[PDB]
Design a protein around this ligand. Structure first.
Ligand SMILES: [Mg+2]
Ligand SMILES: [Mg+2]
Ligand SMILES: [Mg+2]
Ligand SMILES: [Mg+2]
Ligand SMILES: [Mg+2]
Ligand SMILES: [Mg+2]
Ligand SMILES: [Mg+2]
Ligand SMILES: [Mg+2]
Lengths: 261, 109, 110, 261, 109, 110
RNA sequence: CAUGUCAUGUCAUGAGUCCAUGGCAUGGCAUGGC
RNA sequence: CAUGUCAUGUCAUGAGUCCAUGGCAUGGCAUGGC
């Protein structure tokens, strides 16, 4: 059942080419540049990359009709990356099948301590191989095959990634809604960002505070705007706090409350 | 019972409720116009097209349709409500049965 | 022509505010029993709500909540659930309106 | 005959969406985030981009079977760029058809002084529109249409761009061939790079010199390795020079010539 | 006439020419083996597959084939040439007609 | 097994050197007339080429150029143009070899 | 997705080689496109 | 291809508004993927 059944390449000459690394042919001096290019897999990898991104895009585009472009882009990033497809490649043992001029073994070699992008390339090259062999009918077999591979990756990503966290059910007017109920000019009701999103921590934390420093709410999200909203929603859920400040505003003369001081 | 926070929201909600219906009745045409647009969309301007794929315009049209006819029912009494209301008059003033007010009193004891 | 674009936006916003308004009424408002209690004994209720009790809104909210505790929300129930039942292609009115009067309205314009 | 006939979008709702810029809908506060995303063209542009790159890749891949990945990549760069597709978009008057919330006119506006990437986006969005409308049969109409658009761009690029300059007919052994005929250890036969390729000037110039500084040849290419080869080929074409140095080597004692000094 | 630069290339070219044929005849099998491989390519190792799409291996096989038979013709005389050559012998030593040498002499005057 | 990979490369290189060698001969070499002139009067020719004239190569190059000025390049013409006439699928020998002897070679191995 | 330019390692290339020229891998720096 | 974070301009949003909150455009800086 797993992994998904690998689409077969009918042409034997093509099936061999995807596994030929340039180190094998590029060192043969009697070959013309053209003959070299038709020998190794570099063209297939190049083509395979565009195909990969093409059908991955179509997969997620249809599966998530309400996703924005930033979410479709972020999700695709997980599917088409070299790190991801390298692991799929190892899964199919492309891996050992690859023909190089050097040692893939021997852990003391610099190769093993690198990013092994070579193992990603052979996956794209295999896809490209299918497209040269039989462009028509191997294309849908690529979709159906890459759908199956993507499913577990999509599941984990949409769950555990902040960028993909659903922003619906959120109240965009929550900040104004809060100010309406409680805030007045001299209250100095504001929002401070305690944590800005980074690569290491793609989270934002914003606190909703009043003038004296009292924190009415806290929120977390993909960015300051989203976090600030959640902070407002956090404060809006506490009725005793709101009713306190709502009453507090009523006790302030309209004379005083409209100023900032 | 009856928090201040609940009260300022209720007054704003009821107010906005009435203004909203007045604006709809005023601005919206009936279903005849809405059905004219939705049937052949060619002549209809490009900017309004996405609106026809959303519920708001149709619902607006149907409410104006209910208004062009009788059977606004609840909706009319709501707009006129502000004028009919009086402090010392304890009557409900709506179309609801006075006997149902009796049972709800007993229920909440 | 008909259906100006600027008017469409005002309409769409108005319809949205209408629905959001009614929902918040049902949510926050108690029934006429709770209202009648508060308005009758105002010595118990918090001081801040007194001017509010003297105005039409709270009573109107309590009565709409009352119709909701009962049946005969009528149009109101349809309107809140309208967003769901809307399909991109439906030529039917979906409301309690008689389709026969829809025809009599047709030639009236003509 | 020109421009190529624009593929038509049957669905009227979709045809309208490609021309709706987010400034139109995103400012409408009564709309849910989902309703917004289904309103503007951002998803169509996102999808349209991957389609564009997909069929452009397939076009050049087949048209140039002997091109390397670096050449297929460099060529594609000319076809799929925002600057290129912006001009195609203007050509079809997408342009004025676009619906924004601001003034596209009024040259004193900051918009006109920018990169007008907005005009590129609507082209991709139009492509994406065709794919949602009728994915099956509008796809080949996209190839046939983009083939026609690409033809003049491909022609100019393969001619006037150094990266795309054909490296066949070049002699990879030319440098060794030269040393064989003339060079000896004490001749100090070497190559100096006078000009390294840059963004402003993607040319490399290398001179083939002997020990005393005499320049036997000069060459130009996409990089030092290619330029150096042409410099060798330049020196190899002059027989009187070669025959002079070949004779010169014979007059040197094998005792002396094998050292570097 | 006869530049030094031309002469060092000619000696290297002729030398490499002879070595090349010897290496081919030695290493290459005949067409029977080459036709065995090219017909069913399954058993044939993956590394050699691209070679079968290039001319070199076939030409090598055919030359070894011509060698397994008679009719090496020119090719045999070329290898043996080094041994047959003598300084004071002015004969061409090849299969070409001596009368054709006469006409070429006259032509180049 | 048959056809070792390391041997294939040596072969392919050898065949390539073979063709490149013959072409450079035809290009650079004059005919037997020019050779016979130089070898006969060596007082005229440049001093550097004298040891070269005493060795087999120059004569062999001159004679191959001679066969080229004439016809009867024979195998040699076929070999240089071989690269062109090669098609990925051809089961035919393409040379002057009799295909009848191709059969007699077949069962010889068997 | 490619390109350019270096450092190291390794494998090759060439015909005067104590010389000369390249392929790959790893790691920098830089460029360009999506 | 998107993301994050700012500056300016402009258009909007909200119910105590001398307050508060957003959309877009242009221009920086930064991140991530191909
Ligand atoms: Mg590659
Ligand atoms: Mg890739
Ligand atoms: Mg790749
Ligand atoms: Mg976009
Ligand atoms: Mg793009
Ligand atoms: Mg784009
Ligand atoms: Mg590097
Ligand atoms: Mg910016």
């Amino acid at each position: 059942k797993w992994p998904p059944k690998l689409p077969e390449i009918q042409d034997l000459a093509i099936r061999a080419r995807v596994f030929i690394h340039k180190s094998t042919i590029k060192d043969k001096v009697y070959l013309s540049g053209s003959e070299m290019i038709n020998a190794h897999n570099e063209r297939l990898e190049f083509l395979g990359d565009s195909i990969l991104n093409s059908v991955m895009t179509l997969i997620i585009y249809n599966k998530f009709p309400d996703y924005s472009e930033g979410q479709l882009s972020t999700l695709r990033m997980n599917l088409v990356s070299n790190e991801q497809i390298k692991q799929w490649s190892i899964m199919y043992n492309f891996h050992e099948k690859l023909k190089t001029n050097f040692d893939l073994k021997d852990e003391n070699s610099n190769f093993q301590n690198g990013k092994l992008k070579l193992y990603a390339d052979v996956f794209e090259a295999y896809i490209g191989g299918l497209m040269e062999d039989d462009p028509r009918n191997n294309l849908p077999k690529i979709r159906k095959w890459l759908r199956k591979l993507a499913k577990p990756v999509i599941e984990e990503a949409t769950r555990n990634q902040v960028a993909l966290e659903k922003t619906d059910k959120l109240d965009m007017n929550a900040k104004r809604q809060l100010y309406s109920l409680i805030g007045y000019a001299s209250l100095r009701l504001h929002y401070v960002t305690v944590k800005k999103p980074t690569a290491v921590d793609p989270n934002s934390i914003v606190e909703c505070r009043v003038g004296d420093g009292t924190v009415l709410g806290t929120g977390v999200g993909r960015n300051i705007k989203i976090a600030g909203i959640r902070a407002a929603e956090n404060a809006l859920r506490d009725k005793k706090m709101l009713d306190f400040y709502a009453k507090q505003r009523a006790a302030i003369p309209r004379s005083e409350s409209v100023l900032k001081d | 019972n009856y928090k201040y926070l609940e009260v300022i929201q209720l007054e704003h909600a009821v107010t906005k409720l009435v203004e909203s219906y007045n604006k709809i009745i005023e601005l919206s045409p009936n279903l005849v116009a809405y059905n004219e647009a939705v049937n052949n969309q060619d002549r209809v301007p490009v900017q309004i097209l996405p609106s026809l794929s959303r519920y708001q315009l149709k619902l607006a049209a149907e409410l104006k349709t209910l208004h062009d006819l009788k059977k606004d029912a609840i909706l009319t009494e709501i707009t006129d409500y502000e004028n009919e209301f009086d402090t010392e008059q304890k009557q409900p003033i709506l179309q609801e049965i006075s006997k149902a007010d009796m049972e709800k009193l007993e229920k909440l004891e």
